[PDB]
């Protein structure tokens, strides 16, 4: 019962969530906003469906798996349509309720947020984004930019939050240690709740995590000819060398603070940390965790590099209205 041909799109556009500069700052958490205004033909009836298509390179939620499309509701809360999302086709199917049997001259407005899908965009690139409402397409050219490591002599590090589970209250951090493959002497990495400044200085910050013996920490060695994705997200760990049992890990080094002793290294490593957080903290954006890399430089003192992640959120909207059928 697809009625895309009965949906008339009167306005649609793609806009950037933080700054209109033609560049999606994906590691700054910059979202993409797709807005669509459309009319629903009077012939549309309960159970009929329409579709909304996201660009293949975008995804409604970057770090959670729990996306459910927002209802389309009228001003008093009547549900006009219920939506289901197919991740594989990047498509919402909206199914109309008997609202459309009781009202006519029905129109609706969708505001759908999305992020760069790191699986589809492993490295920086130019994209021609194309979104669609009921098969009516609109496009926007953008560049995707990712972050760079903080570099101080041979200390060089970067990290992202790569997953968030709001049911089990776990957050996953993916850390690139020495991505530049430098000769990093006496390498130690600290992971801590709250903040680590670019120069390694600790700060309390505005979020927290819980780090203890039940924190999960895995460490992988990257070969000299292996290239890490700029997205900072690893979807398959199988081609890297698991060296978790060959480095020293102290999950209780300090208060909510773990550290890893690497010694002298000449290679990049990936560290994946799964820590807990305070239930509900995601609604206050109060989940924050940082990393510090220390090495000994050629002048016999320590060089530090720091990196901190936090979370951002968006909320879709779907509204409509109509006049009562006599």
């Amino acid at each position: 019962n697809n009625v895309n041909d009965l949906i008339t799109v009167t306005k649609q556009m793609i806009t950037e969530g933080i700054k209109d500069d033609g560049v999606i700052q994906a590691h700054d958490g910059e979202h993409i906003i797709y807005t669509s205004d459309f009319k629903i033909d009077n012939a549309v009836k309960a159970g009929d469906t329409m579709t909304v298509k996201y660009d293949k390179h975008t995804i409604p939620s970057d770090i959670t798996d729990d996306f459910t499309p927002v209802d389309i509701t009228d001003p008093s809360g009547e549900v006009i349509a219920k939506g289901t999302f197919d991740l594989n086709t990047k498509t919402i199917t909206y199914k109309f309720t008997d609202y459309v049997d009781r009202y006519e001259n029905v129109n609706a407005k969708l505001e759908l947020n999305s992020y760069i899908d790191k699986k589809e965009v492993p490295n920086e690139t130019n994209l021609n984004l194309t979104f669609a409402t009921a098969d009516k397409e609109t496009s926007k050219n953008v560049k995707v930019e990712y972050q760079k490591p903080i570099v101080k002599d041979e200390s060089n590090i970067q990290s992202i939050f790569s997953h968030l589970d709001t049911t089990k209250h776990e957050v996953e951090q993916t850390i690139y240690v020495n991505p530049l493959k430098l000769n990093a002497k006496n390498t130690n990495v600290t992971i801590k709740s709250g903040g680590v400044a670019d120069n390694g200085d600790y700060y309390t910050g505005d979020g927290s995590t819980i780090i203890d013996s039940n924190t999960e920490i895995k460490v992988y060695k990257v070969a000299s000819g292996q290239q890490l994705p700029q997205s900072n997200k690893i979807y398959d760990y199988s081609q890297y060398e698991d060296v978790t049992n060959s480095v020293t890990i102290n999950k209780n080094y300090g208060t909510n603070m773990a550290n890893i002793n690497f010694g002298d290294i000449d290679s990049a490593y990936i560290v994946k940390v799964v820590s807990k957080y305070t239930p509900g903290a995601e609604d206050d954006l109060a989940v924050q965790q940082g990393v510090r890399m220390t090495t000994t430089n050629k002048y016999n003192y320590s060089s530090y590099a720091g990196y901190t992640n936090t979370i951002l959120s968006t909320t879709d909207s779907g509204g409509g209205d109509g006049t009562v059928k006599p």
Partner: peptide, 10 residues
Amino acid sequence: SKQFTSSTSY
């Protein structure tokens, strides 16, 4: 509900 992403603190 909400949809989420990772960001950088500075």
